[PDB]
């Protein structure tokens, strides 16, 4: 009998390696609204040593961090693109992630897009799908 395994096929060690090594995060869909999940996860990641660049062309600053209108506008290397936007918006952000030389595209709950995941894979990025960075951090490293 096999148990529910994650759709992205990554082991707990694979996720642990990502969470340990890749800490330059572009958090797409960042929001200053305390009720938004993007706000909660951004606050958590900042508390745990992540360098979190908010990405949302609507805002100039989120949680005291300069907020950028695209992943490509960030003046630093970016390792993980952490997605908090609706599925169809993720295609453009994956294209930006590829151009930026990011290593990991991370689909948070309710953001998964098959075509975007396809592009990431073909470009050699790691895909994390239907997981939360905060929940995975709490579970594996907390
Ligand atoms: C994807 C998700 C954000 C959709 O929720 P929703 O209520 O429909 O919200 P919307 O997508 O309309 O808007 C969310 C934010 O996206 C931002 N957004 C919209 N278009 C954007 C774009 N092109 N680029 C960057 N951000 C954008 C908006 O500004 C908005 O923030 P605001 O409310 O401060 O303006 C929601 O399902 C998400 O929170 N999923 C992740 C949940 C989960 O992983 N939580 C973890 C808990 S452990
Ligand atoms: Ca494009
Ligand atoms: Cl996938
Ligand atoms: Cl604004
Ligand atoms: Cl704020």
From TrEMBL:
Highest taxon in the source lineage: Archaea
GO MF annotation list: metal ion binding
UniProtKB keywords: Calcium, Metal-binding
InterPro entries: CoA-bd, NAD(P)-bd_dom_sf
Pfam families on file: CoA_binding_2
Domain CoA-binding stretches: 19-111
SMART domains: CoA_binding
Coiled-coil parts of chain: none
Chain residues that bind CoA: 31, 33, 36, 56, 58-59, 86, 93, 109
Name this protein carries in UniProt: CoA-binding domain-containing protein
Organism of this sequence: Pyrococcus horikoshii (strain ATCC 700860 / DSM 12428 / JCM 9974 / NBRC 100139 / OT-3)
Species lineage: Archaea, Methanobacteriati, Methanobacteriota, Thermococci, Thermococcales
């Amino acid at each position: 009998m096999e148990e529910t395994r994650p759709i992205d096929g990554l082991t707990d060690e694979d996720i642990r390696e990502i969470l340990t090594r890749y800490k330059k995060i572009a958090l797409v869909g960042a929001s200053p609204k305390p009720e938004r999940d993007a706000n909660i996860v951004m606050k958590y990641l900042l508390e745990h040593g992540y360098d979190v660049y908010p990405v949302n062309p609507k805002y100039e600053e989120v949680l005291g961090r300069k907020c950028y209108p695209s992943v490509l506008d960030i003046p630093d290397k970016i390792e993980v693109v952490d997605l908090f936007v609706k599925p169809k918006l993720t295609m453009e952000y994956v294209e930006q992630a590829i151009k930026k030389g990011a290593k990991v595209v991370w689909f948070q709950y309710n953001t998964y897009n098959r075509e975007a995941s396809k592009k990431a894979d073909e470009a050699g990025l790691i895909i994390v799908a239907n997981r939360c960075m905060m929940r995975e951090h709490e579970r594996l490293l907390g």
